[PDB]
Design a protein around this ligand. Structure first.
Ligand SMILES: *Cc1ccc(-c2cc(C(=O)O)cn3cc(C(=O)N4CCN(S(=O)(=O)c5ccccc5)CC[C@H]4C(=O)NCCN4CCOCC4)nc23)cc1C(F)(F)F
Length: 151
């Protein structure tokens, strides 16, 4: 059976991720405000055996949605894809749903398996969408921490 855990994520500047309507996630500082707004992910361990990366899929807990990477105008793009809850999650997830989780300096990166060198990213600015970016180590933020909830 596919192994999965429940968790929340925060970017390296402590912005939490929230659902911004049906089609996207946004990142903002929820300190001082109720953290019940943050998305709870169901991170599943999928097939990819890689050396220093762990292939995972990121589902939105109790919402039938998965983070996916699709090409739009020659640019890899992060989308929320609706799925049949009976068929998901699965050990062999489609490549568009797969992210290679990379541990680096006590933080996590999520690189698209479909589009190498593109990562789950947040802006330094408040309340901007979570997106797939192709720069790392600049202004855009590709480092996260997981707050483990349950297995
Ligand atoms: C990639 C990965 C997968 C799974 C886990 C993991 C697995 C289990 C389990 O199988 O039982 C348990 N568990 C607990 C924690 C955990 O305590 N964490 C999450 C991991 N991190 S981190 O993401 O910041 C990190 C990543 C990489 C290297 C170092 C650190 C540390 C934070 C911590 C946590 O959740 N603390 C919350 C405590 N807090 C106290 C107050 O009340 C609210 C809760 N992970 C797992 C781990 C990982 C890996 F990311 F690699 F760590």
């Amino acid at each position: 059976p596919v192994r999965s855990l429940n968790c929340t994520l925060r970017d390296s500047q402590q912005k939490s991720l929230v659902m911004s309507g049906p089609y996207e996630l946004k990142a903002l500082h929820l300190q001082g405000q109720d953290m019940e707004q943050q998305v709870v992910f169901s991170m599943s361990f999928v097939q990819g055996e890689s050396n220093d990366k762990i292939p995972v899929a990121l589902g939105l807990k109790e919402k039938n949605l998965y983070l996916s990477c699709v090409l739009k105008d020659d640019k890899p793009t992060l989308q929320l894809e609706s799925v049949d809850p009976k068929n998901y999650p699965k050990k062999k997830m489609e490549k568009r749903f797969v992210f290679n989780k990379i541990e680096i300096n006590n933080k996590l990166e999520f690189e698209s398996a479909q589009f190498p060198n593109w990562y789950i990213s947040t802006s330094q600015a408040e309340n901007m969408p979570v997106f797939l970016g192709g720069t790392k180590g600049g202004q855009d933020i590709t480092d996260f921490t997981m707050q483990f909830v349950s297995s």
